[model samples]
Target: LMSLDTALNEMLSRVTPLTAQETLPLVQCFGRILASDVVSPLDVPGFDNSAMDGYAVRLADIASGQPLPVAGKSFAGQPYHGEWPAGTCIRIMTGAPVPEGCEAVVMQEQTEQMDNGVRFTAEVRSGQNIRRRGEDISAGAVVFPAGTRLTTAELPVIASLGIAEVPVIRKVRVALFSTGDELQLPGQPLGDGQIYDTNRLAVHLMLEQLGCEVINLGIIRDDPHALRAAFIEADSQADVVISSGGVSVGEADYTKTILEELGEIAFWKLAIQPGKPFAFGKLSNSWFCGLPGNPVSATLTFYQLVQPLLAKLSGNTASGLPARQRVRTASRLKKTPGRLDFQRGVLQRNADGELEVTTTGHQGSHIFSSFSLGNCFIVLERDRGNVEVGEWVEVEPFNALFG
Candidate 1:
């Protein structure tokens, strides 16, 4: 048995994130990774605008308790058109441009209103209540770098710069399926030894949430010909071929046998919990990630191992892998020396601003129901185990759950 860290570093010896090439509009670029830097074409606020509904006038007039006649009204999309005469003011709303001659703004709430005009009761400085032009963003500045991951907040920024399209990383293409004779699809009749193909849907949904372009090859039987055909089709359609079952050394296991005969084995099997007989290799232009058939193992291996490799191939930056944090475990954690374990758990802050964690249910690989209600994974190191509560440990928060 090999140590989990040694096994992982061995597999990814020379691979790096692929260079991105595709470009898409900002509306369609929500989850896509940026291939090139995005520069601001214009200032965020194209011109000087207002931060609040107030009067644009000379600062000297404030605190004199003098009422100035309202020259014009400036709503958000509308600005004062006429030139400002001396000793007059403009009624400006939020986001409205500063009129041609005004130097300061007086908030409506700080002034006393009368029938004739508006009177200021507070001392205000020039440029107060104003958003300066180009203060938020400057022209020709890099708003986002090449390796930036596009999120919801960046959409409006792209729009404000008059940029409708952006160059982004290529879509992640994955071909996946199950390889068991007893597995049945939904809405079909069941056999005595048959179980519904739950792992297929679960893994597919996980990949879907990660923004992969997946190709479903349906379920394959134990027959060698059927499994071989699955590989061929996957090799043609995707950047990676992902499958669960038939990777272990069982009589019915043909996944490992076929892959061994077909391509070079990058790495196989680790002394990890649940997922042990994981396989990694490349067939032509496509990569291969063969996961164990066990449900929990399939899920665990996908998140821990295969996910990182897939990200690298999909052009995710080297430093862009999901970050892990240190938190206090709530209960005792059991483990052996050889394999790393990612036990599912919930993470939250207490009243004193301390982060605490607790396991959701059974840590068994087969006890599926025990590991619900958690969006974060509690990763225990491969060399360390039998952790005591309140000890600082590693945690990986699920990207899909929060974003």
Candidate 2:
């Protein structure tokens, strides 16, 4: 067995970002990986505009509470373009372009409308409340770099620059399913020892959250004929085939046999808790990830292994993997020094506003309830032993899966 870091590094090193690209409309760009740099075509705030509803005037003109004659009004899309008259002010609305020769904006509340003009009582500073042209973004500047994942926040920035479409990597297609005769779909009557097939639905949702198009092949029993047919279909239909079960040392586990028959198994197992019986390989044109049978193992292994692998295959660099944060443990953690432990925990800021985490409950791989009640994995190093309270440790908070 290899270390978690070592396994991930090796896996990532063997994969490359997808080369195919497509242009998508601005509305469809969010959550897609950018294939090229998004440069600003025009200046943001195109022209000098009002940042607030106030009076736009020559700063030097407002002093000693003197009255300045009202010139005209400037509303959005109807900017004042007439010649500037000395000793005059323009009533400007938010987002209205500042008239020429205007030096600052004075809040309307700071001035009172007089019979002849407006009178100011407060000091007015030059260049105050003026949103200069291109202040937020300059023309031809890179708004977002290549490999950046477009998000909701970036959509407005891109749209503000008049960008209608973006070049993004195509979504990765994932063929998914589970293997086990004892696994039954939820809401179905269970047999003597059957359990609901939670891994298939959980993985399907996880794949979708990662921006993948899932081709769910449903659940396959332990029969070799059935498993072989499923593998054949996956190899032809998907870029990745993800399964949860039949990877560990079990007599009825035929997933590995069919996978090896179709392609090469890059590696098997890892020095990690709750997910040691994982497998990674390539089958024909499809990459494969075989997670252990336990529900928590299936979930944890996907995040710890398949998530990064899928990211790399989905046009992201190794550094683009979901980031982890360091936090102190609020509860003591017990573990041996053989494998890395990803204990389920809830993360929150303590009274001192410092990041702290506490385990949800038991750390057993089969305890799916822990994940339901936890938000993050308290990652303990394989070489580290028991953890004392208040000790700093790495924690990988669940992404969109648990968010």
Candidate 3:
């Protein structure tokens, strides 16, 4: 078995980000990493505008209860035509362009209706409720630089800057399959010796969520000739090939044999419990990842090891994957040295408001229910002994790439 760090270094060395870039409208670029710095052509807000639905004034108006002529009215998307004199004011709506010669706006609650106009019963300050030019963003400034993941909050920034188009990496296409006759899809009848293929849906949904197109190659049933054909077919269609099962040291496992027969078997076996059968290699043009058979172990290895490779192959930079964090133990962890373990955990706020996490019951690799309920993975380091409560342990949060 290989050490976790060695397996990671060996796999990362073979994976390089694909340069599949394209330009799309900003509205459709959510969750895509930027390929180039998007410089703003104009300032956000476009021009000096109003931020309130009130009255635009000069702040030098007459004292309490003084009536002033209602010069004009301004509304959003429609700037008030012409200018208002110093003593007069304009009724301005939110997001409307500020009329010329006005320094501030007074809320309607502070103004009272008069015989023929409006009267200010309270004091107002200069530059209040006014959105000046370039206040939100300056012209020529980059809205989002290259390699940035476009998120929800960033949408408004692009829209506000009048950027209708953006450049980003194309979604990676992944061909997925498993090589065992023991597997069956869910909703189908289960025979005495058959088990549902849990890795299929798990791996497929994972790729779908990452915006990758996952093509299910179905079950290959552990035949050498069939496995070679599937490899050829998968490599021709996808940028990466993701599959789980059939790589263990068993007599019927053809994944290892076919890999050695057709392409290079880069790395196999890791010093990690429940996922020691991890495999990473390449077939033709596509990068290949053969996750373990156990439901929990395969998913754990996918997130910890394979997900990072996919991110890099899909155009992520040098620091492709974000590393997990170190967290203090919330309970006793039973384990022996020599093997790394990724136990499902629940992370939550403590009584004092800090984060506290602990593993769920039944740390078996075949347990899928716990994987569904798990929010974090407490990684047990190799050659490390058992741990008691309050000891700092490493943890990987279920982030954007892992759910």
Q: Please name the candidate that would achieve the greatest lDDT relative to the true structure.
A: 2
Which lDDT value does model 2 have at 282? Answer: 70
The better-scoring model by TM-score among 2 and 3 is: 2
Question: What ranges in model 2 sit over 4 Å off?
Answer: 50-78, 86-95, 101-131, 161-167, 184-195, 247-257, 317-320, 349-355
Error of 1 at 264 (Å): 2.0
Q: Model-by-model lDDT, in order?
A: 0.77, 0.83, 0.78
Best by TM-score: 2
**Model 3 weakest lDDT span, ten residues long:** 246-255
How displaced is residue 69 in candidate 2, in Å?
6.1
After superposition, which runs of candidate 1 have C-alpha atoms over 4 Å from their true positions? 1-27, 36-39, 52-75, 86-93, 105-130, 139-141, 161-167, 180-196, 223-225, 248-257, 323-325, 348-355, 373-375, 389-393, 398-403
Error of 2 at 40 (Å): 3.6
Query: What TM-score does structure 2 among the candidates reach?
Result: 0.81
Worst 10 residues of 1 by lDDT: 244-253
| Location of the lowest summed lDDT over 10 successive residues in candidate 2 | 246-255
Across 1-403, the per-residue lDDT of candidate 2 in tens digits comes to 7788888888888876886899999998878888999998898879998989889999667853468888898999898978778888999989999998889998888888888999887887889999999998888889888888888888788887777899999999999988777888878899988988888888999898888999999988778898888889987989888876654322234555666688887545679997677677778887888777777878888888888888888886437456789898899998789998988899998888888899898887656788779988888888899999989989988777887
- What's the ranking of the predictions by lDDT, best on top? 2, 3, 1
Candidates, ranked, TM-score: 2, 1, 3
